[PDB]
């Protein structure tokens, strides 16, 4: 119990380097939906609600890719979309012409059928990036309430708690992220099993219910599936993503390192001051998943449970102490007595409502930014967290190689934007905990 081991915990040290860049599968805060009230049929109906399509042009090139290939891929997309327009029976998904641009982007010249003695390349520093403000903005927006509902009230005693939480989260942007991920991962999987040898065009779609109750169908952009041959569950299918955004890539080019960004149209918006014209961009990039990653993505709903459970137990940490059940007290008014943020004014608190959403966002970003860096940090930072809590209450944790623990943690801090955030977060926690 003899406590005397101090403000020994120091801040974690984060990498120097170029700023970290976006690496989620789809866009997050920068996403743009075209919406209305068979995916391809709905895709076209959604695109028809836009009347600013123009000649696509590159505005932010991919420093490592063949950019005209990106431009051509989009043009090909439009072209093939025209072919489908009208007709009579519009297909699901649709197979695309195996053109030069698509072969290239979908890594088809890396196809084993091609090469020589060079077929003997056997080699055996993953490059540090600094934290950037963008990932925190990302998370902020993730905790926000939306003007739409993304989930039914269930899964289409303490069951009362389920309801309270669901009431507080169904309109959360994090929840949209969940559903966006379920739909397009499911979609990508089917296409991957039902084609294998086809370059499929997959609309990125989600559904929601407005405030006024109308059912809405959203189009985020397109994904083109590459060759998907192999039953290896960890084997990867290459795809290229094509996502609509109002976000100018040039404000934070660093965020978009993996992207070619086209300008694909201009949009006329209603505004506090009238009609304003804003460029519409297409964010393009190559990528890949596996049956396993698609499976995990199809199950992001788990974030709701995990998120909930924490909020649940968090009530026991008060209900057993106050003798009476406290779900109603909390959810019906006050106890905005949990810290959840910093501001210019400093420390800041929020109610179980905000908390519900914040924990949802956290669970969701864990899933969106899943990485070995993250597995490590979590496991290891939990320990430092335990220790920091003890010392905070004047408790001796014991003879423990703390510096050893720091090594473990800081070696997970290389370049992942999400992990770097959590590190920065801990530092802030660390400053308040041992003021």
């Amino acid at each position: 119990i003899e406590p005397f081991l101090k403000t020994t915990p120091r801040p974690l040290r984060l990498p120097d380097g170029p700023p970290c860049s976006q690496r989620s599968k789809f866009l997050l805060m920068d996403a743009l939906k075209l919406s209305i009230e068979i995916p391809l049929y709905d895709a076209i109906k959604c695109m028809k609600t836009f009347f600013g399509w123009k000649e696509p042009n590159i505005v932010k090139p991919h420093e490592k890719g063949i950019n005209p290939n990106y431009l051509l891929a989009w043009k090909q997309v439009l072209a093939e979309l025209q072919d489908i327009e009208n007709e009579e029976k519009i297909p699901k998904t649709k197979n695309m012409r195996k053109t030069s641009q698509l072969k290239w982007a979908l890594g088809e010249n890396m196809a084993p059928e091609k090469v020589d003695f060079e077929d003997c390349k056997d080699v055996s520093e993953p490059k540090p990036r600094s934290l950037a403000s963008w990932i925190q903005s990302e998370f902020n927006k993730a905790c926000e309430l939306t003007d739409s509902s993304w989930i039914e009230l269930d899964e289409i005693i303490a069951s009362m708690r389920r309801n309270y939480f669901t009431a507080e989260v169904s309109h959360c942007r994090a929840t949209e992220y969940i559903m966006k991920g379920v739909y397009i991962n499911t979609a990508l999987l089917n296409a991957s099993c039902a084609a294998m040898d086809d370059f499929q065009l997959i609309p990125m779609i989600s559904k929601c219910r407005t405030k006024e109750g109308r059912r809405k169908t959203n189009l985020y952009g397109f994904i083109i599936k590459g060759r998907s041959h192999l039953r290896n569950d960890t084997d990867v299918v290459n795809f290229v993503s094509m996502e609509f955004s109002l976000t100018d890539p040039r404000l934070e080019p660093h965020k978009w390192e993996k992207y070619c960004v086209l300008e694909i149209g201009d949009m006329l918006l209603r505004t506090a001051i009238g009609q304003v014209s804003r460029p519409m961009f297409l964010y393009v990039r190559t990528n890949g998943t596996s049956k396993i990653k698609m499976k995990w993505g199809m199950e992001m709903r788990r974030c709701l449970l995990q998120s909930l459970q924490q909020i649940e137990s968090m009530i026991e940490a008060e209900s057993s102490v106050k003798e009476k059940d406290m779900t109603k007290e909390f959810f019906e008014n006050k106890s905005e007595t949990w810290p959840i943020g910093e501001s210019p004014k400093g420390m800041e608190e929020g109610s179980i409502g905000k908390v519900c959403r914040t924990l949802l966002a956290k669970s969701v970003f864990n899933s969106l930014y899943a990485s070995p860096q993250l597995e490590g940090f979590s496991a290891e930072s939990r320990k430092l967290l335990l220790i920091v809590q003890a010392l905070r209450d004047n408790l001796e944790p014991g003879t423990f190689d703390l510096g050893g623990l720091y090594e473990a943690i800081e070696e997970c801090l290389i370049n992942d934007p999400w992990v770097l955030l959590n590190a920065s977060w801990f530092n802030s926690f660390l400053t308040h905990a041992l003021k």
């Binding site: 998370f139 959840i340 943020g341 910093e342």
Partner: peptide, 16 residues
């Protein structure tokens, strides 16, 4: 405006 930080919860909620 508030930058959200879920780790701050642990100023109050005990780890685990």
């Amino acid at each position: 405006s508030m930058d959200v930080n879920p780790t701050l919860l642990f100023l109050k909620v005990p780890a685990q």
